[PDB]
């Protein structure tokens, strides 16, 4: 027989290094949503993302979601590099009831929610971070979308706000979209998260007049990006295999397989349904 049809009922943790995301997908793991602390500093050859994962913080959406998810997985680690950001006058460390950690209103531990000061002042912020290191940085920032024009001025004074992140060769500017949206986790407002890669020797500028979900640092980007992600509900067992599918690992010398199109590693070439001999 030349087509392997039997897979293991588990995912082999050897020799490939697997990391179980459990209640967090790879996106909330980068943002630092509640429950995503077990991924801090983790390194993986294959990130195992569970379909049963749930959102545990502010309702958000990511323009070009699959690109950031691929960048986070292809990197293969969660090495945060905290940085001090000299925000002037504005309030910091905003917390929300839809992001309750230990029944305490919290937020993404990698993001900083900037609000207007108690003196009703949200001045222009123009901070600059220079990448004078030997590695590429990955900054993740967000833009808050309130529900009403009253919420916009109550949080950031200025209406409309504006978020503008720029590098030496690129610039992304966003104006908040206001409007009551469907109730998600007790909130009609949403946050749109973005990312920007800063090469060594390049600069990045965070310029805002309101609605900025500021980052608390950046992630290290490996020079070699060799890892990947696998979304499956199959548990991790104790077998030994260098082949993995969304239905389980495979141990075979056969040259073909009719199990799953999604395969990672030392895996036989997938074929359509059916299987015969020679």
């Amino acid at each position: 027989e030349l087509v392997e049809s039997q897979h293991l009922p588990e995912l082999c943790p050897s020799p490939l290094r697997l990391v179980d995301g459990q209640t967090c997908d790879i996106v909330n793991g980068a943002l630092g949503s509640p429950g995503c602390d077990h991924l801090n500093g983790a390194e993986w050859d294959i990130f195992i993302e569970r379909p049963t994962a749930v959102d545990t913080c502010y309702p958000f959406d990511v323009p070009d979601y699959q690109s950031l998810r691929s960048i986070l997985a292809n990197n293969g680690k969660f090495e945060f590099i905290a940085e001090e950001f000299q925000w002037s006058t504005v309030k910091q460390n905003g917390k929300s009831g839809a992001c309750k950690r230990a029944n305490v209103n919290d937020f993404f531990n990698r993001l900083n929610w900037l609000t207007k000061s108690d003196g009703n002042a949200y001045p222009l912020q123009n901070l600059t971070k220079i990448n004078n290191g030997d590695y590429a940085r990955l900054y993740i920032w967000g833009v808050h979308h309130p529900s009403t024009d009253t919420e916009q001025t109550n949080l950031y004074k200025n209406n409309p706000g504006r978020v503008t992140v720029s590098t030496k060769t690129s610039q992304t500017s966003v104006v908040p979209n206001i409007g009551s949206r469907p109730w998600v986790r007790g909130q009609s407002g949403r946050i749109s998260f973005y990312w920007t890669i800063v090469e060594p020797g390049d600069l990045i500028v965070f310029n805002t007049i309101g609605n900025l979900i500021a980052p608390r640092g950046h992630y290290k980007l490996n020079s070699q990006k060799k890892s990947t992600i696998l979304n499956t509900a199959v548990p991790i067992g104790s077998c030994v295999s260098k082949c993995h599918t969304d239905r389980g690992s495979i141990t075979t010398t056969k040259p073909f397989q009719n199990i799953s199109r999604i395969s990672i590693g030392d895996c036989p070439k997938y074929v359509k349904q059916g299987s015969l001999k020679l």
Partner: antibody, heavy 118, light 113 residues
Amino acid sequence: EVQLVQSGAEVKKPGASVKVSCKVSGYRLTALSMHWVRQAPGKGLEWMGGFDPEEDETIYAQNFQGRVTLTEDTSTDTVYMELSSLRSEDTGVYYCATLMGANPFDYWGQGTLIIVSG
Amino acid sequence: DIVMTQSPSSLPVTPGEPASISCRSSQSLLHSNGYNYLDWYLQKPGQSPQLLIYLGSNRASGVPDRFSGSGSGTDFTLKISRVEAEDVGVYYCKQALQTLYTFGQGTKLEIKR
């Protein structure tokens, strides 16, 4: 064994559109990846397109300028190849085959000669 | 695209004598499985293509034992121990790694004269 039967010869004046058939007997097309390779007379084999099990999408060779149109009828177990904008260089034998790179099998058809001269 | 450069182009061979056709690719055709995804086809005169060697060196179904293959990576070779009149035609090597299959130019097998 799987039997691939191609439609009879077709002669269409230049600028028309052909429609070649390939009926599979001995295996469901629902479990087979079909491909297409033409050979100009006195020359060599040229891959035109087919189906990739992975990615799960009929991939057409861009060298044919998207003129190829691969449709499959799962009820009759027949693959259809439609080449539009016929020119004087599109004359030759057109094969349908379940190539080895996609399926564990490797069977071919008799060929459907297409003469473009009007 | 991966380029296949078969050599030679014309292979006159005396019957009852061996022969060799080298098929050289432009990229490594060795998957992590160790399975070199390259096949050898033979198009007999006025005949549809037929398979001779599959997966690098494994002989296809019903193929006589005189045929044989070898090679790995970007260098492969098809061989026949005792060529006969049943072996005339043009041989092509495929490329199964990338599903965008790219055949070779083909080597014609004439009888030495």
